[PDB]
């Protein structure tokens, strides 16, 4: 059949959650910096021949908005953890937008993805081990990312929609 599934891409001001979604809606890399306040953004996608209507919340970084987050973490199904792979902070700041949703929804079971973005880079600080373990930690996928060469992409947000699939039953 036909099933929307609300999404919600968090984490550190400037991990990529703009330039991840506007990736898989858009087909294109922005390689400009435009701070994101709030955007919502949709794809119609065939999921284990499910047709998935992703309706998919771009939230902000910026710690100036961060009263908004109550709000779209009770509506959201389920949650896409972005961290940088060169950005240990936004690695360690996984912890407390975790700790957040999992309160705001009175569910430790939450459906939720760790994604590494930034995978075309070189110069990385947070290895594959470290953030594996994390996820394992969790007991939630791990999956590495790049906006840029779409690495990873289309895996992260198909994942977390079998995440809430999974979590419906
Ligand atoms: C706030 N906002 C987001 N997109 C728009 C554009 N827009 C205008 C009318 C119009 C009708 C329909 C939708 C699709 N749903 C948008 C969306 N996707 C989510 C995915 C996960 C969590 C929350 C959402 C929402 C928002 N819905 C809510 O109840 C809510 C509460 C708090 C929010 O901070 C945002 C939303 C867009 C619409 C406004
Ligand atoms: N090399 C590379 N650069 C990326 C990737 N994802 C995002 N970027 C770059 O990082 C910068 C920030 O990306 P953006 O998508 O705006 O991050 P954001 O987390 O939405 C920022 P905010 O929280 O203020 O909305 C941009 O210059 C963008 O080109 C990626 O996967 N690889
Ligand atoms: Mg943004």
């Given at each position: 059949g036909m099933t929307e599934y609300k999404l919600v891409v968090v984490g550190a001001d400037g991990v990529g959650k703009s330039a991840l979604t506007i990736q898989l809606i858009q087909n294109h890399f922005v390689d400009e910096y435009d701070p994101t306040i709030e955007d919502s953004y949709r794809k119609q996608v065939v999921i284990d021949g499910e047709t998935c209507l992703l309706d998919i919340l771009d939230t902000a970084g910026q710690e100036e908005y961060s009263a908004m987050r109550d709000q779209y973490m009770r509506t959201?199904?389920?949650?896409?953890?972005?961290?940088?792979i060169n950005?240990?902070?936004?690695?360690?700041?996984?912890?407390?937008?975790?700790?957040?949703?999992?309160?705001?929804?009175?569910?430790?079971?939450?459906?939720?993805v760790l994604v590494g973005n930034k995978c075309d880079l070189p110069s990385r600080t947070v290895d594959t081990k470290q953030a594996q373990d994390l996820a394992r930690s969790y007991g939630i996928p791990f999956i590495e990312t790049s906006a840029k060469t779409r690495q990873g992409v289309d895996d992260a947000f198909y994942t977390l929609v079998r995440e809430i699939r999974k979590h419906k039953e």
């Amino acid at each position: 059949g036909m099933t929307e599934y609300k999404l919600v891409v968090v984490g550190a001001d400037g991990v990529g959650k703009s330039a991840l979604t506007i990736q898989l809606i858009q087909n294109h890399f922005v390689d400009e910096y435009d701070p994101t306040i709030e955007d919502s953004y949709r794809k119609q996608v065939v999921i284990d021949g499910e047709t998935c209507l992703l309706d998919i919340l771009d939230t902000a970084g910026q710690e100036e908005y961060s009263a908004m987050r109550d709000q779209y973490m009770r509506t959201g199904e389920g949650f896409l953890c972005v961290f940088a792979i060169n950005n240990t902070k936004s690695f360690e700041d996984i912890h407390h937008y975790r700790e957040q949703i999992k309160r705001v929804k009175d569910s430790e079971d939450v459906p939720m993805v760790l994604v590494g973005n930034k995978c075309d880079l070189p110069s990385r600080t947070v290895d594959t081990k470290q953030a594996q373990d994390l996820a394992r930690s969790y007991g939630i996928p791990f999956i590495e990312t790049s906006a840029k060469t779409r690495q990873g992409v289309d895996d992260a947000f198909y994942t977390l929609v079998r995440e809430i699939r999974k979590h419906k039953e």
